[PDB]
Every structure is written in structure tokens, then in C-alpha cells.
Design an enzyme around this catalytic site. Structure first.
Site, PDB file in Angstrom:
ATOM      1  N   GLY A 138      55.892  44.204  56.338  1.00 59.71           N
ATOM      2  CA  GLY A 138      57.017  43.836  57.200  1.00 59.71           C
ATOM      3  C   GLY A 138      57.618  42.471  56.868  1.00 59.71           C
ATOM      4  O   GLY A 138      58.701  42.130  57.361  1.00 59.71           O
ATOM      5  N   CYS A 168      58.694  41.525  53.837  1.00 60.22           N
ATOM      6  CA  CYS A 168      59.678  41.575  52.750  1.00 60.22           C
ATOM      7  C   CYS A 168      61.056  41.115  53.227  1.00 60.22           C
ATOM      8  O   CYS A 168      61.446  41.379  54.369  1.00 60.22           O
ATOM      9  CB  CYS A 168      59.728  42.951  52.093  1.00 60.22           C
ATOM     10  SG  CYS A 168      58.149  43.475  51.373  1.00 60.22           S
ATOM     11  N   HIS A 176      64.452  47.681  47.729  1.00 60.96           N
ATOM     12  CA  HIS A 176      63.472  48.709  48.080  1.00 60.96           C
ATOM     13  C   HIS A 176      63.516  49.118  49.559  1.00 60.96           C
ATOM     14  O   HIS A 176      62.767  50.014  49.938  1.00 60.96           O
ATOM     15  CB  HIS A 176      62.054  48.361  47.630  1.00 60.96           C
ATOM     16  CG  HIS A 176      61.345  47.317  48.440  1.00 60.96           C
ATOM     17  ND1 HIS A 176      61.063  46.059  47.913  1.00 60.96           N
ATOM     18  CD2 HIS A 176      60.775  47.411  49.665  1.00 60.96           C
ATOM     19  CE1 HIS A 176      60.368  45.422  48.844  1.00 60.96           C
ATOM     20  NE2 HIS A 176      60.163  46.193  49.914  1.00 60.96           N
TER      21      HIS A 176
HETATM   22  O1  LIG Z   1      50.003  48.956  49.673  1.00 66.26           O
HETATM   23  C1  LIG Z   1      50.870  48.432  48.975  1.00 66.26           C
HETATM   24  C2  LIG Z   1      52.079  49.223  48.496  1.00 66.26           C
HETATM   25  N1  LIG Z   1      53.250  48.409  48.159  1.00 66.26           N
HETATM   26  C3  LIG Z   1      54.007  48.985  47.036  1.00 66.26           C
HETATM   27  C4  LIG Z   1      55.178  48.122  46.630  1.00 66.26           C
HETATM   28  C5  LIG Z   1      55.628  48.156  45.312  1.00 66.26           C
HETATM   29  C6  LIG Z   1      56.692  47.378  44.902  1.00 66.26           C
HETATM   30  C7  LIG Z   1      57.336  46.587  45.826  1.00 66.26           C
HETATM   31 CL1  LIG Z   1      58.665  45.587  45.307  1.00 66.26          CL
HETATM   32  C8  LIG Z   1      56.930  46.533  47.145  1.00 66.26           C
HETATM   33  C9  LIG Z   1      55.817  47.277  47.548  1.00 66.26           C
HETATM   34  C10 LIG Z   1      55.200  47.091  48.941  1.00 66.26           C
HETATM   35  C11 LIG Z   1      56.252  46.940  50.063  1.00 66.26           C
HETATM   36  C12 LIG Z   1      55.614  45.983  51.064  1.00 66.26           C
HETATM   37  N2  LIG Z   1      54.655  45.216  50.249  1.00 66.26           N
HETATM   38  C13 LIG Z   1      53.968  44.068  50.768  1.00 66.26           C
HETATM   39  C14 LIG Z   1      54.482  42.787  50.586  1.00 66.26           C
HETATM   40  N3  LIG Z   1      53.902  41.651  51.002  1.00 66.26           N
HETATM   41  C15 LIG Z   1      52.748  41.752  51.640  1.00 66.26           C
HETATM   42  C16 LIG Z   1      52.092  42.980  51.903  1.00 66.26           C
HETATM   43  C17 LIG Z   1      50.828  43.059  52.544  1.00 66.26           C
HETATM   44  C18 LIG Z   1      50.224  44.269  52.739  1.00 66.26           C
HETATM   45  C19 LIG Z   1      50.842  45.444  52.324  1.00 66.26           C
HETATM   46  C20 LIG Z   1      52.058  45.411  51.702  1.00 66.26           C
HETATM   47  C21 LIG Z   1      52.723  44.180  51.461  1.00 66.26           C
HETATM   48  C22 LIG Z   1      54.478  45.739  49.002  1.00 66.26           C
HETATM   49  O2  LIG Z   1      53.844  45.224  48.104  1.00 66.26           O
HETATM   50  C23 LIG Z   1      54.140  48.169  49.297  1.00 66.26           C
HETATM   51  N4  LIG Z   1      50.818  47.161  48.580  1.00 66.26           N
HETATM   52  C24 LIG Z   1      49.746  46.249  48.952  1.00 66.26           C
HETATM   53  C25 LIG Z   1      48.598  46.292  47.959  1.00 66.26           C
HETATM   54  C26 LIG Z   1      47.948  45.028  47.518  1.00 66.26           C
HETATM   55  C27 LIG Z   1      48.845  45.764  46.582  1.00 66.26           C
END
Ligand SMILES: O=C(CN1Cc2ccc(Cl)cc2[C@@]2(CCN(c3cncc4ccccc34)C2=O)C1)NCC1CC1
Ligand SMILES: O=C(CN1Cc2ccc(Cl)cc2[C@@]2(CCN(c3cncc4ccccc34)C2=O)C1)NCC1CC1
Ligand SMILES: [Cl-]
Lengths: 306, 305
Positions: free
Chosen positions: B143, B145, B41
Site C-alpha cells: 500500500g 507504492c 503498475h
Molecule cells: O509479494 C510481493 C509481490 N510484489 C510484486 C511486485 C513486482 C514489481 C513491482 Cl514494481 C511491484 C510489486 C509489488 C507491489 C507492492 N510491492 C511492495 C512494495 N513495497 C513494500 C512491500 C511490502 C510487502 C509487500 C509488497 C510491497 C511490491 O513489491 C508486489 N513483493 C514482496 C516480496 C519481498 C518481495
């Protein structure tokens, strides 16, 4: 999201760990530049511990009596001296892996990472706090002496603890890297006991702010308190007195959440009186006191989950 | 004496962390030999995450579109490919700090250390377990990931997890180093949720043995139980079923303390039905399930790396 007891990455410290042997006693040493630092009790037998005369034991030793091993390489000792309860062994090779470092003496309530070692080899890393009674609740077996505690704020390693002993209650005592013990302990096998321990109030408050940042508010209330009334109550539960310095240190966490420090103190008072009633705070059923205000700011998001 | 949640020393993994940037997305990569592994991603914008076609997004990228930074040195990408949900970036420099390693897929109940990273720089290390629902209760911000989970055996690092996402309940999901997700998750912005979780029974038993090794014995009793009768209690309290394999795995801890596994099961049954009555075990008011039988043995013996 989430909140874990997090240690600093230990790589910079692993590259400094060596094994020090004097006769039949083997423990760990810290190799920085051309000096290996280790507990002075490496020169003692079990019988010497009752009333050791370290100066008399040390004068009978030559440089070649100390065996220092870094990985599978033997280092040559070219000098030795004693500074307080630490032995400083000058070696003929500077550690090529020496990081940027400082020796810092910490206060009770401050946290640090411990790299537990045996025979100069690292086994694990965990987070600790210097208790108000100057002991640490570590995880150390025989052979762990010389293992160190440290913080790594901005790529510089600040060494704050060196392990020396386990007390009868299963807690641990040691020195700063200048060999000065934390607390009223001595590197002697005499009657010594950890004084009654107390809870680190400023740390519990910091951890309550951490729960608020992560999206939890169930424990808050409409009440406030004065600092002296809060202290009168807290000390009844064996909590450390909260000083104006602690209130100042909680400022940025108070600003991020919009909850005044004395308002959080009122929540703490209520939690002490009522318990959690089947609830948890950051996955814990007890009030956590081994996270400082600085640790919470470092780990938690700068954005509160309102 | 003492019992702490202990992570493996992270030095061997710190020397592998790099920053990977593709356009406006920046995350962490794992540099082993001449390949940098990272979540696929990294090639997506926020809008792409809605319904991404990873092969179609990737074909539009050249090697020079990927910026890889190791410390303050820019690595040159000379090839790229996708394996499941992981991107493999071939670089022109082999990592001189590559440790002895393996890629291993772990089972629920197994623990590992996480080296949390931001911008290719390690920030902290903590221990966690793969929950029965395939999520991990980690501590990660935006950040993080590409941060990895691992165990060590002698000199060999076994990489078992790479961080990809956070779920609405604040728990985390990721893949093994071959890009296969743990759990029924997908790398896309869609409604996904952590399923109902359970307690790792064999781990709670291992931690009760750790408490006995450390002098906490108040919870022991004269009673024993059959495995069938205990499993009826376990099901009632949302505990995972205990199998004959779990009983065998607890053998060395049972031998060190002289307490039969089914004897310890009767102690846990009474704790489940009565609580702790104002008492704690190893400084905890909850039954801890993120220490495996091997973790307890390792911590109470002093195994080094
Ligand atoms: O606001 C989002 C959008 N996320 C879509 C999404 C969908 C699929 C995948 Cl593989 C990846 C992602 C993101 C890429 C970064 N990421 C994060 C990973 N680890 C801690 C995090 C802490 C805060 C924000 C994001 C985080 C994801 O889940 C961002 N997620 C947070 C919401 C609670 C749910
Ligand atoms: O069996 C002893 C005798 N100890 C006297 C003594 C007196 C002063 C000093 Cl600075 C040092 C020591 C020793 C040197 C090793 N050591 C240990 C350090 N860290 C963890 C340990 C875990 C198990 C055994 C020993 C440990 C000491 O306390 C050994 N102490 C432990 C008994 C519970 C109370
Ligand atoms: Cl301090």
C-alpha cells in the site's frame, strides 16, 4: 519490510510556528487559535538568567514590546500572561491553520517527533524519547528554543514538549505546553546536571519483537526468567526496572510473535552478557531503546515473517 | 549540540498526496497542478505483474476507471498517459497546495526524506540514502507504492524518488518522477535481487567531521595518508573509492574543524583496521554512511525552509 526511526508528518505543526522577539532576544512560538505559546525566558538577557525574577521582568513589559511574526506578517499582541515557565501571548488573529490538538504531559520512555525551528522557520524533523532522567537527546542549536515535540495519532496533534535549554552534557531539557518542566530543571543558569541516565528496557524489548516480526530470531534462547531475576540482572547494566505494567503493554507484540515477554527478557539478559558477536539487529550494533511498544505496532507489519 | 538523522519538514509534500485506485489495486499518487503522478503498475492485477504489456493494459482503460481521492473529495480524471514507469493522470482541478518544485534525479550516496503514505494519507517521515547498489533501505508495507522521496532548497521541493517495490532482502526500489528506475530493476514480478552493496566513504568522513564538531575526538591521530594509499584500504573493506571531487566537497567541514581531509582519512583507515575497541561515535558502534557533507553542514548551521 524495513525498520526506521520514523517521525510523524510535520505539516500540521509547521503551520503553527512563528517567531517571537522581545528586545534583543529572538526565539520560536507556537500559534494555536489566538494564543502564541513560547518559553518565558524570551524576556531575559544573558545576565538575567543567573537569578531571574520573571514576575518583575514581565511587569515592566507592555503588549507592544512583543513582536510576533508569522511568515512575513506581523501579528498584534493584545494580551500576555505567564503560566509556569511559558509565556502566553494573546494575538488579534486566530491561526487559520490551527489543527485539531491537545496538550499532553508524557512519561519517561515515551517517544515524540521534534520539529526543530529557527526564527519561526522549520529546519528539520526527527524522532526523540523522553529519557528516564527527563532529558531528551535532541539536535538543537542556539535559536531553537520554543521548537516543539508532538505525536499525531488519528489526525489530532498532541503537543508534549517545548524546548528551553541545553545542559552541560549536550542533552536537552524543556517543558510540557503548560510550562511545567520535565525533570528537576529550572529556566535559570545555575548548576544543573542530567542525573545518571538508564536504558528504557520496555522499549528495547519492543524493538526485539520488531526484529522478530521482520524475520530475525538469532538472539532468542531456550531460557526463561522470573521478573525479579530479570530486574536484578538488568539494573547491573543500567537498565530501567521492568514493571508488570510494561509486561502488560508488551502483550500484543508477544501474541503476534508467539514469544512470551519473560522469554524475550531471557534473550535480553543473554544479549547484555554476550554482546552481538559481529551481528546486527535491524541494522544496529547497539540495543535500541527509542521505539515504544506502540511505535513498533504502528510501523511493523501485522504479519510476522515466520 | 546533538546529531540526529533528520528529515526535511514534510508539510509541502503532505499537501500533494492523493489515493489512486484502478479496479482492485489501490496506491498513492502525487498531485502537482492538474496532474497526478503514480506507479504505472496501478493498472495491473497480480497475474498481470508476471509479464505485463503496459500499453496494452492501458489502452483498455478509460479516464473514469481511475478513482482519485484527495482527502474526502473525488477528483475527476480527464486524461491519462504513460511516461516510462509512471502514469500521469490529468485531473479537472489544479492542486491549490502545489508548492514550488522540480523533478531531480539523484546519484548513489545522496540522501533524501521519504514521506511514507497509505491510502493517500501520510503516516511518517524518515531520512534515507540512495545506496551504491541503487536500492534504498526504507520502511514500507503493502500500500506504500507511490510514496515519494524529496529534498528542499529554500521554498523549492526537489522530488527525487517514487516508491514501486520491495526486493527479497527487504530493501526497496523505485524511480525518479520521470519514471526511470534507479538500478537495474523492472516493474514486473520476476527474479530480481539487490546487488552487493558498498559503504559510502565520503558520507562516513562527513559523519566523522560531525562527531568532531560535537566533541567526539578520540579517533583522531597524528597520521596522514595519500589518496592512493587510502583507496587501497577502502577497496579491501567494501568502501566506495574516494575521489578528488569527494575531497573538494569535504572542504568546508575540513575548514570548520581544522582537520585536513587526508588527516581524517588516516583516522578512518585505523578505525577500519582496528575497530572502535568498545567505544562509540555519536552514539553508534558502526560507521554511519547516510549523512552527506551537505547534511552535516545544514544540521550544524540551522538552515530553515
Ligand atoms: O509479494 C510481493 C509481490 N510484489 C510484486 C511486485 C513486482 C514489481 C513491482 Cl514494481 C511491484 C510489486 C509489488 C507491489 C507492492 N510491492 C511492495 C512494495 N513495497 C513494500 C512491500 C511490502 C510487502 C509487500 C509488497 C510491497 C511490491 O513489491 C508486489 N513483493 C514482496 C516480496 C519481498 C518481495
Ligand atoms: O550557553 C548556554 C547558556 N544558556 C543558559 C540558559 C539557562 C536556562 C535556560 Cl531555560 C535557557 C538557557 C539558554 C537559552 C538558549 N539555550 C540553548 C538551548 N538549546 C540549545 C542550545 C545550544 C547552544 C547554546 C544554547 C542553547 C540555553 O541553554 C542559554 N547554554 C548552553 C551551554 C552548554 C551549556
Ligand atoms: Cl506517556
Amino acid at each position: 519490510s524495513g525498520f526506521r526511526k520514523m517521525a510523524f508528518p510535520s505539516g500540521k505543526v509547521e503551520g503553527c510556528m512563528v517567531q517571537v522577539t522581545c528586545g534583543t532576544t529572538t526565539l520560536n512560538g507556537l500559534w494555536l487559535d489566538d494564543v502564541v505559546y513560547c518559553p518565558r525566558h524570551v524576556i531575559c538577557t544573558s545576565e538575567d538568567m543567573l537569578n531571574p525574577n520573571y514576575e518583575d521582568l514581565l511587569i515592566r513589559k507592555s503588549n507592544h514590546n512583543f513582536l510576533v511574526q508569522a511568515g512575513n506578517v506581523q501579528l498584534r499582541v493584545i494580551g500576555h500572561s505567564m503560566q509556569n515557565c511559558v509565556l502566553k501571548l494573546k494575538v488579534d488573529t486566530a491561526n487559520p491553520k490551527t489543527p485539531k490538538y491537545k496538550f499532553v504531559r508524557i512519561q519517561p520512555g515515551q517517544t515524540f517527533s521534534v520539529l526543530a525551528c529557527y526564527n519561526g522557520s522549520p529546519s528539520g524533523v526527527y524522532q526523540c524519547a523522553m529519557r528516564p532522567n527527563f532529558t531528551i537527546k535532541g539536535s538543537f542549536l542556539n535559536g531553537s528554543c520554543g521548537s516543539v515535540g508532538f505525536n499525531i495519532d488519528y489526525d489530532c496533534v498532541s503537543f508534549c514538549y517545548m524546548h528551553h535549554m541545553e545542559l552541560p552534557t549536550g542533552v536537552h531539557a524543556g517543558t510540557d505546553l503548560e510550562g511545567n518542566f520535565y525533570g528537576p530543571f529550572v529556566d535559570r543558569q545555575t548548576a544543573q546536571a542530567a542525573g545518571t541516565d538508564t536504558t528504557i528496557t520496555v522499549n528495547v524489548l519492543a524493538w526485539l519483537y520488531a526484529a522478530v516480526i521482520n524475520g530475525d530470531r538469532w538472539f532468542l534462547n531456550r531460557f526463561t526468567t522470573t521478573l525479579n531475576d530479570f530486574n536484578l540482572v538488568a539494573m547491573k547494566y543500567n537498565y530501567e526496572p521492568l514493571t508488570q505494567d510494561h509486561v502488560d503493554i508488551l502483550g500484543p507484540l508477544s501474541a503476534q510473535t508467539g514469544i512470551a515477554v519473560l522469554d524475550m527478557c531471557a534473550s535480553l539478559k543473554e544479549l547484555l552478557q554476550n554482546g552481538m558477536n559481529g551481528r546486527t539487529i535491524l541494522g544496529s550494533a547497539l540495543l535500541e531503546d527509542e521505539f515504544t511498544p506502540f511505535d513498533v505496532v504502528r510501523q511493523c507489519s501485522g504479519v510476522t515473517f515466520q
